[PDB]
Design a protein around this ligand. Structure first.
Ligand SMILES: Cc1cc(C#N)cc(C)c1Oc1nc(Nc2ccc(C#N)cc2)nc(N)c1Br
Lengths: 551, 401
């Protein structure tokens, strides 16, 4: 049928006229098939014949099985107004409430069942060519949503939403999820009281031009839905098989990380890092990558987790969400979110370096922030966290750090490894500690550098480096003070950059140097680090600067 | 009435801005509110043929109020609300003893909006877990939040205030977005009595910061140089850096003398005694830094930018400037970081409006996502300034108190 629902106005893009594409001459097979498909559509009101006054055209093709009309709306789409995105996201099983019985209905010839704005129909005109293009073709245009047109998806969904509006009001108990041609219906009614309410809907949809399949052509649990396996009072992910392969191609690793990644929504502690490292370096999709020990190490740990099935629970809007995070390695965090202890709603992982250097405490907060947004999306509320960091470690960090950081309701849970800052810089200079005025120069053109220091106890060292920048040198100069120095040291520098890095208490870096420097700072008992302006003739800055200025 | 035609006009197309996620309770508040607004004919459901979108949130004391982010729309309508229907800003306003901010946005709900503009005021209430498709509306009447609304209404705003202004000629009244700024050198009870008087004019016709503001009490925070009995090498270095930085904003600063003080390669802990001239310089700089910057003037054609630094222990510092480091006002503000930060942001923006008739672009020391998640929780204004996220370079922190 063709819903009675009022149409949606549509318009071409402002500076644009409708398309006038040439119909390439077709083969007779195809001519015949089109004529055939077109009469039948014509007979159900889907298309109407038109004259040669209508000056718009699009191409038509037919592919085989049995014949199918393919129209090419490349031009009309490029030429038609933009629209609002259909759906802004896809529900997550963790967010769903449990249901006693569910039914999945499929709408038949969905687009062809919804009318096209009269004013717009003109532009959909297309032409069945005559054998060898001797004579005028047959011209038709659409009276309904065509397949492949830019507007069909959106307009269908609005239409369907308008059509459902009343029925939902009338049936607050029941729930319906609209995606594409499909409707997904559920209730906590018992199988016969449900089945009736399905019917009121099916009739309801017919009353509006939308047909569906008959009272015993409809599924029973478990439902397979958007890669999930949905059961009435639980859910998990469609079944994951990790291949046994003696040889792994890029493509094979790519797809595996995909599956593992997908798997991590419910299986705790999936890790994918060492597998992803294999993917660095642009290699062919068919190139075989030797597994490293650590990737192999990882691949088995994943297999253990997967061997026995895991399921997740649905959401209960009366209880609170509790979210736990654990550190599962360097840069690797894993979390689980639940409402009753260990009945997991969902699971997941975070492993993201923001910037160049970072510390566990920062990472934990980034992780909290990610889960917080994620919960707003799925449950409309944020959780209570259960973090592996002492309140006092957290207190120390936030107050003395210069970025604003804030995490909501939480508690320390003792689930090691614990988050800790591994060194803290002093706040005041250290008496009876040597003072290293450090510096670094680099010729911008030879790229040689010089890294050095001078001290208040007389020492002077000045090494020579090769292909490095000003930045690297002023960092090599700090590494040096920390190597040659004792357990307590004061270190003075003119680089704001170096200060930056280090003042932030990194414990992880993308620089090998900074990782050397971190090692050193962990060994010290005390460090104090101070800054002065370059080239201002300062006591001691001036002296290292001379020593370091050849090249 | 008949509706003022509006235009974006060239090849700026309207706003297509994602809707940030909202908590269950905010969403509810929003449907409760928008069912009424539809009822009263203020907004209408729209269909998919409207590709435009502007984000909305809800805010609070006891009732929820709806707030819409027209930041983009404002940006893309600039020629109309600024050059084609400008509201001049009075310089007099900061000079007043007491300024009171009054919400008048409920006025704009009476004027209708140019039918061919409405499409651009589209917003979406979204749904938990993406279960439903999310209710789409658009404005039929002037919206609160869009700088076009007071542009249109000023013709009306002027008639309403005519008598009050005629009878109170030393009271200065300024309109920024949904608010009226009302300034007097009156005594407070009088200032306050005149405010009630003003409210009643409005009531026929249809209608952090504590209470009023006090712009004549708005002195900049000097860069402050510790006074010290005793000086260490460290302390001088800190002092030299802190002055050497100040030199590049303040004309007249000198350090020479203290650099003398730092002669050799010495220990930081080592103390070093104040010179004749060294001391002389210090107090001479102290003097410069107290008085504002010589050379820096507001250019209305450049954007105002605002930096903020977390000073620890509930304290924040801030600077407004157009060209970097050339400060036009510097300041200070005094239970959790984000809350405090959003208060400072509102404070700084409020002053900024009083002084220049324009909001600053903020450089916020916080992770984007933290901020986006949490800002709406404490926010209480009806505008939203523009903002970017930035890492506070750790010295600038130090150079401001
Ligand atoms: C009803 C339904 C079925 C399928 C499908 N397929 C997919 C979706 C998104 C569905 O919508 C919802 N389902 C549920 N819970 C739920 C509970 C059990 C089962 C099962 N078995 C399925 C869904 N809650 C909702 N609010 C919505 Br909306």
């Amino acid at each position: 049928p063709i819903s009675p629902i009022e149409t949606v106005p549509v318009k071409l893009k402002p500076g644009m006229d409708g398309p006038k594409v040439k119909q390439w001459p077709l083969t007779e097979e195809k001519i015949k098939a089109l004529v055939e498909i077109c009469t039948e559509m014509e007979k159900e009101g889907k298309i109407s014949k038109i004259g040669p006054e209508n000056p718009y055209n699009t191409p038509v093709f037919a592919i085989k099985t049995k014949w199918r009309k393919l129209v090419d709306f490349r031009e009309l789409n490029k030429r038609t107004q933009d629209f609002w995105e259909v759906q802004l996201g896809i529900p997550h099983p963790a967010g769903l409430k449990k249901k006693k019985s569910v039914t999945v209905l499929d709408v038949g010839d969905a687009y062809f069942s919804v009318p096209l704005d009269e004013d717009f129909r003109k532009y959909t005109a297309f032409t069945i060519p005559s054998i060898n293009n001797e004579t005028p073709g047959i011209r038709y245009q659409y009276n309904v949503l065509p397949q492949g047109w830019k507007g069909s998806p959106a307009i269908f969904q609005s239409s369907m939403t308008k059509i459902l509006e009343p029925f939902r009001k009338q049936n607050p108990d029941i729930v319906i999820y609209q995606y594409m041609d499909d409707l997904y219906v559920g209730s906590d009614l018992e199988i016969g009281q449900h089945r009736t309410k399905i019917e009121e809907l099916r009739q309801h949809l017919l009353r509006w031009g939308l047909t569906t399949p008959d009272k015993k052509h409809q599924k029973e649990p478990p439902f397979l839905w958007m890669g999930y396996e949905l059961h009435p009072d639980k859910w998990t992910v469609q079944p994951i098989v990790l291949p046994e392969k003696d040889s792994w191609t890029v493509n094979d690793i790519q797809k595996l990380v995909g599956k593992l990644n997908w798997a991590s929504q419910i299986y705790p502690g999936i890790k994918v890092r060492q597998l992803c490292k294999l993917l660095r370096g642009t290699k062919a999709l068919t190139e075989v990558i030797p597994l490293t020990e650590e990737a192999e190490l990882e691949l088995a740990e994943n297999r253990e987790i997967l061997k026995e099935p895991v399921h997740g629970v649905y959401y209960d809007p009366s209880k609170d969400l509790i979210a736990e995070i654990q550190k599962q390695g360097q840069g690797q965090w894993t979390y689980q979110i639940y409402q009753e202890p260990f009945k997991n709603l969902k699971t997941g992982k975070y492993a993201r370096m923001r910037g160049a250097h970072t510390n566990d405490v920062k990472q934990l907060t980034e992780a909290v922030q990610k889960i917080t947004t994620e919960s707003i999306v799925i449950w409309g509320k944020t959780p209570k966290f259960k973090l592996p960091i002492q309140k006092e470690t957290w207190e120390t960090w936030w107050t003395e750090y210069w970025q604003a950081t804030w995490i909501p309701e939480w508690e320390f849970v003792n689930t090691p490894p614990l988050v800790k800052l591994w060194y803290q810089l002093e706040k005041e200079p250290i008496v009876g500690a040597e003072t290293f005025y450090v510096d670094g120069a680099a010729n911008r053109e030879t790229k040689l550098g010089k890294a050095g220091y001078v001290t208040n106890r007389g020492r002077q060292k000045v090494v020579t480096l090769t292909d490095t920048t000003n930045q690297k040198t002023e960092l090599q100069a700090i590494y040096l003070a920390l190597q040659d120095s004792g357990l307590e040291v004061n270190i003075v520098t003119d680089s704001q950059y170096a200060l930056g890095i280090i003042q932030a208490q990194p414990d992880q870096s993308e620089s090998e140097l900074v990782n050397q420097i971190i090692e050193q700072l962990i060994k010290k008992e005390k460090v104090y680090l101070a800054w002065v302006p370059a080239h201002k003739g300062i006591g001691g800055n001036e002296q290292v600067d001379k020593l370091v200025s050849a090249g | 009435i008949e509706t003022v035609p509006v235009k974006l006009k060239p090849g700026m197309d309207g706003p297509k801005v994602k809707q940030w996620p909202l908590t269950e309770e905010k969403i509810k508040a929003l449907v409760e509110i928008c069912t009424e607004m539809e009822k009263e004919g203020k907004i209408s459901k729209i269909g998919p043929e409207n590709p435009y979108n502007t984000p909305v949130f809800a805010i609070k004391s006891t009732k929820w109020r709806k707030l819409v982010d027209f930041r983009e729309l404002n940006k893309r309508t600039q020629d109309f609300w600024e050059v084609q229907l400008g509201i001049p800003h009075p310089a007099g306003l900061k000079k007043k003893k007491s300024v009171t901010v009054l919400d008048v946005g409920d006025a704009y709900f009476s004027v209708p909006l140019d039918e061919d503009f409405r499409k651009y005021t589209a917003f979406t209430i979204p749904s938990i877990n993406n279960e439903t498709p999310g209710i789409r509306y658009q404005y039929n009447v002037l919206p609160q939040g869009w700088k076009g609304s007071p542009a249109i209404f000023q013709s009306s705003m002027t008639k309403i205030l005519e008598p009050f202004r005629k009878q109170n000629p030393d009271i200065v009244i300024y309109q920024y977005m949904d608010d009226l700024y009302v300034g007097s050198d009156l005594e407070i009870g009088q200032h306050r009595t005149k405010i009630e008087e003003l409210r009643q004019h409005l009531l026929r016709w249809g209608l952090w910061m504590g209470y009023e503001l006090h712009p004549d009490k708005w002195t900049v925070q000097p860069i402050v140089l510790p006074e010290k009995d005793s000086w260490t090498v460290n302390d001088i270095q800190k002092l030299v850096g802190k002055l050497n930085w100040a030199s590049q904003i303040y004309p007249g600063i000198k350090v020479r003398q203290l650099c003398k003080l730092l002669r050799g390669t010495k220990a930081l802990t080592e103390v070093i005694p104040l010179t004749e001239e060294a001391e002389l310089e210090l107090a001479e700089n102290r003097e410069i830094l107290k008085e504002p910057v010589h050379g820096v003037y507001y250019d209305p054609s450049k954007d105002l930018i605002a930096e903020i630094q977390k000073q620890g222990q509930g304290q924040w510092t801030y600077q407004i400037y157009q060209e970097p480091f050339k400060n036009l006002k510097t300041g200070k503000y005094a239970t959790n970081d984000v809350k405090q930060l959003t208060e400072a942001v509102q404070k700084i923006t409020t002053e900024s409006i009083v002084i220049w008739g324009k909001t600053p672009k903020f450089k916020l020391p916080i992770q984007k996502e933290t901020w986006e998640t949490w800002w709406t929780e404490y926010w209480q204004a009806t505008w939203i300034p523009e903002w970017e996220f930035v890492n506070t370079p750790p010295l600038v922190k130090l150079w401001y108190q």
